[PDB]
Symmetry: D2
Subunit: 385 residues, 4 copies
């Protein structure tokens, strides 16, 4: 199950580059040069990398150092054929961001956040990114009086409307993807789930420029079904990008390699991405555990891609099995896809078979046959089929 | 802290009427006649009651029994001055609903669900309800292959579009409020949070007919900040109705009396409802614990209203305290309410004070003074102020 | 992967016999006669069944009806060769139990709970059970003032000490297994996890008569690692019995068939049970979803056993693979099993290589190689090995 | 509500000294000198401070620097009258600890962990500590094959037995308190709750030397009732020390000031500590949010003490109110405290009023009156009484 660049696997610089500093411990690994990560990921079969501004150009770099970091990076992409499909801004590490970027209470900080963002959109375009992610990890509060959330959503809409004005003014071909997270590092983060981010987008001045970048572990931090939230984002036409990883339930954001965590959810997510024909990058936002040395980093990144390809093969064998197609009909999945009342309202109202003569007891007695379908899915996942 | 009808407190018939049957135990209380609940709630100071169809007219009642249940009920409302501001449909108890109402896999059941719904909308209008709630507690799945969620959202949009066609065709003055819940009784429920329900509404044919009816305990079942989700529903103009209760964290849906559960969240929710001027019903969707007899039922319903009125007084004393107004300025809440860039994009781009000459270290060093503000809020809640 | 009676798979009568009544819905299946469940489970390859008193003899049965229910049951066990390795008492359904059995505030109810229990211990012995489970699902509270927990633990120790006096007085060969659950149906249940139940046992008059019956879904309702809690129960010598099922995270108690829920946890649990040589029953405490008819009931019960046998084969292939044995040495699992200081305290204190001359930087730089080990485990589980 | 040293309030050096580095951000505050924290806490009314070795003497300090840090510290305690009732070891920050201290897979690291521990026990004794805490935050795993937990509990018992040998050999008057935490920074931490730590202690060679140091936010990270776990630790005689703080549900470890988080749980915890007569330190293990400057640090530490004193006054007014004493009798709290069967087993067995003539329906019909009791508790907490 060997990845190639045609599988569209991507990685953040900050993922394999995570030094292992956690809330309770020092770094366990030395910093990697971005050039070295590009080379090593290209050897494992990835298609490309992504970056925050500050991963690529150290905070406070002069214009001359900037251009040098960029030139070196561009050389490694040329040398390897790696692409950069997505970029984002760090509006969370520097102390100035301690109360947020776009929704900081201090107006001066909010203007600074927008300026730092627009400078990186230009860079992203130059390097060919098609998607610009926004994770507002510092937007929110630990206490109720610290943040009026209606005012905060006004400031958040204002920031995103200004960015959509900027891109359209420049004539760039870049769309935005907002990434929800329910908590951590703030006590509560604004737009905490995919549903909250989708609903927010519909109030922007140009909603067609914005979609979501959901992350597996983030929706599971709220105990939600990740494949169900992705189906809603697909239904709305707003799955612009995705972050793949693993999480063991409701606790701190673990960012385990993809396939770790909830393995059945991983299976039904691949099933959905492949059957809806998602064609964006398969991006891993993960942290090799701090127990690992460099060898363990590259083994963890390789397992991300391996697990995706194994689950892809098992979900395709599941949907291709005639015995599964028969079970799906037995459970009336075909009937869920037909209109309830294509005949229209008046006809429904006049239909005695829908009410006055509907035999509720006979309908109630029909089993759904879901457990037999779910064991076929289990047998397929385990290769016991 | 005595409620009057002017406080707009309402209760479902199923709340004080809960017989105490749980997944592991039999009923501990006899059934109440709806007429008796109307009388007892009017004595405690409530403004009105709400109902599912099946709470008021027993499932399978003939037209003659129907009209009799309605006449008796109408007499008790006349006798007490109680109103009925909201009604909803039971699409969850009868076995026919075991796979959903509007998104059941069986198309016949979906048509039946719409017919049962429209019959109750007529009744609701006749009794004067202004809001019709929809809680799809059976819409969802315990396993991944049982429900294609894109098809299920197609069927859910189809159902709600047909209901909006019906109400507009009849010329009724009734709006719909969808109530999210993340799980229970299904393994995962579709539109599991306020954000998911808001985003869904924006894809209906006539979005202006639909809002949300969030419930305190339901968002806390996903570990989310209830006051933050209500602020987003207010920001979108979609807070049509609300269900008030208490929940102790992420576990089964407890439906404790309001003020039980997370008491600080209760305080910041009342603070928000009163400061945004929400004018809908203050409705309690709660279950007096099955340990209680009838005396304990009416004591629990009275505590719902008492706790709301105490929290209202403390939140108003908080916002009225000059020392709190000073702390809010100290924490720059005034600055969060001002536009970040009313000057426009070009001016922001030309402003050297926003970037090239912005002193990040001086801005970073400014404390937010949030803990002093939050202890003032604590002192106010406890009356230690 | 066909089960036989030698695999020691057992089922509660209440599991396949669950009629599908949930907090929001009516029964979707008719009641099964215990005789019919015995016959059907024996056909699928189970080894035996378990019962609460009230599953086998309807509450309030006269002595004559009692003896008749027992005789019929005994005939079906004779006809099939099924055993009864475990029995328990229903101290949760009847309204009298609304505040608990052994820790009800009313003393009369507590004495009644003990009498109902002892009557069923006699029956259990007669039918050959070796383990008597105690699940105190009504022991706990929805509010802080309702239960003094020190007094409640006094009453709980008193009840269990009286039962251990009874069994020793009668000379029965039966041990007790307490089953923890953190909540539901009470707001909080006493002894909410395996750790709490283990610690409690050590304060009983004869601790050797009591162990734990942990359930997969119950520890995961507190977000805990089920295999880690079982290793602690094994370490203490107190794994008397186990309840196998599946749960999707922190929410209501789902009781899905075994292998559903957290599939990797299922794998590491089988790995542990088989490698520590657990020889008790493999008992399924699960509920076929209420979407199912009778066909779906027996398919769900068969999948419990199938999934156990598949995971058993994959965990055995994992531990048998030379490449895995090499990885375990690479990650120093062999060193975890050696004493840290068999040399004794004084020698440790005099050892300069343990402190004064210990090279912390060289030790820190050694990678643990855990991600490579965990991908081997993944490949084994998926059959991609 | 002004604290004095007689209230026994203590703080870790690492609490007010937290620089605000989180998994996503840099420090927002400069480091404090321990001498300055001693002085500032003594001014706010605290009784004493606690320390990890590495908070007081920077890692890798020579013997001469060691003695200097100690002398300066001792001078500040002399100058202020502050005591040091508890000390602990840092076995979590340095990279060498990435797989644990006492249960690291590498045996050399385990011996190093014990040596670093024993050196700090000597210091703790010299400074007068009576309790030595052990928080094994690095003991556990992110993956199932990385840690055999039976071997890991063998190594953990071996470490604690060696420490109990050491203290008894030296004739020190110091006891150990193990602090549970369910996760973070490891995926799962061993002995994850108070129940797990209590049960473990009973397998040590000298159990009387060891108790628990439970933390409010840690049990709530597993969704458990903190006051119920403290009642069990009190019931076992093992509440040696306690860590007070606040947490908003199941998510990362927030360490908010005490009274933040779950305020009703805070009330019932103070009620319990004061009514059982706990006489150890009231220690705050909290982090002033990184939004704060130094002024906000000392305001947050003062609110910890203020909130404790307010809750103490409200819980004492609750238990002193004659109307509450009457409600407690109405809910049969007096009957929970009487033996169920002081008459003995034989008498219970011969008592027809316990079974054959027990009127279950009359007992079932008695209401518990818990909601009226719980609203009295609410009125008391809010000062509405
Ligand atoms: O998810 C996280 C942090 O939780 C980030 O890696 C975003 O994806 C990009 O800033
Ligand atoms: O919330 C619930 C069930 O959880 C219902 O009472 C809805 O409010 C109306 O059907
Ligand atoms: O676990 C449960 C209910 O949650 C019971 O089936 C016990 O196992 C036996 O009473
Ligand atoms: O609780 C924590 C970290 O979560 C520590 O402060 C311990 O109390 C002492 O090491
Ligand atoms: Mn993440
Ligand atoms: Mn991400
Ligand atoms: Mn509810
Ligand atoms: Mn509701
Ligand atoms: Mn269960
Ligand atoms: Mn069980
Ligand atoms: Mn903590
Ligand atoms: Mn602590």
């Amino acid at each position: 199950y060997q990845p190639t660049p045609e599988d569209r696997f991507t990685f953040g610089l900050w993922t394999v580059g995570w030094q292992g500093r956690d809330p309770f411990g020092d770094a366990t690994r030395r910093a990697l040069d971005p050039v070295e990560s590009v080379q090593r990921l290209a050897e494992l079969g990835a298609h490309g990398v992504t970056f925050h501004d500050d991963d690529l150009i150290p905070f406070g770099s002069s214009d001359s150092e900037r251009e040098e970091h960029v030139k070196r990076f561009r050389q490694a992409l040329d040398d390897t054929g790696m692409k950069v499909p997505m970029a984002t801004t760090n509006l969370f590490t520097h102390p100035v961001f301690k109360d947020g970027g776009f929704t900081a209470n201090d107006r001066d900080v909010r203007r600074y956040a927008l300026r730092k963002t627009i400078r990186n959109i230009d860079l992203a375009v130059e390097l060919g990114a098609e998607t610009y992610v926004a994770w507002g990890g510092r937007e929110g509060a630990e206490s109720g009086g610290a943040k009026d959330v209606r005012d905060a959503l006004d400031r958040m809409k204002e920031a995103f409307d200004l960015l959509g004005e900027y891109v359209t003014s420049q004539g760039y071909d870049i769309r935005f993807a907002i990434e929800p997270k329910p908590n951590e590092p703030r006590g509560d983060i604004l737009l905490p789930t995919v549903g909250h981010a989708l609903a927010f987008i519909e109030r922007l001045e140009r909603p067609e420029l914005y979609g979501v970048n959901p992350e597996v572990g983030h929706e599971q931090m709220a105990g939600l079904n990740f494949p169900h939230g992705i189906a809603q984002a697909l239904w709305a036409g707003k799955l612009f990008h995705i972050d793949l990883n693993g999480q063991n339930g409701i606790k701190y954001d673990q960012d385990l390699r993809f396939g770790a965590g909830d393995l059945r959810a991983a299976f039904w997510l691949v099933d959905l991405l492949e059957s809806a024909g998602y064609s964006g990058p398969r991006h891993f936002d993960f942290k090799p555990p701090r127990t690992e040395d460099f060898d363990g980093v590259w083994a963890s990144a390789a397992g991300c891609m391996r697990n995706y390809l194994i689950l892809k093969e098992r979900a395709a064998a599941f949907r291709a099995d005639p015995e599964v197609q028969e079970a799906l009909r037995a459970s009336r999945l075909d009937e869920l896809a037909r209109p309830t009342a294509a005949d229209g309202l008046q006809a429904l109202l006049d239909d005695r078979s829908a009410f006055e003569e509907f035999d509720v007891d006979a309908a109630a007695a029909r089993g759904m046959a879901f457990e037999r379908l779910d064991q076929l899915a289990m047998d397929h996942l385990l290769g016991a089929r």
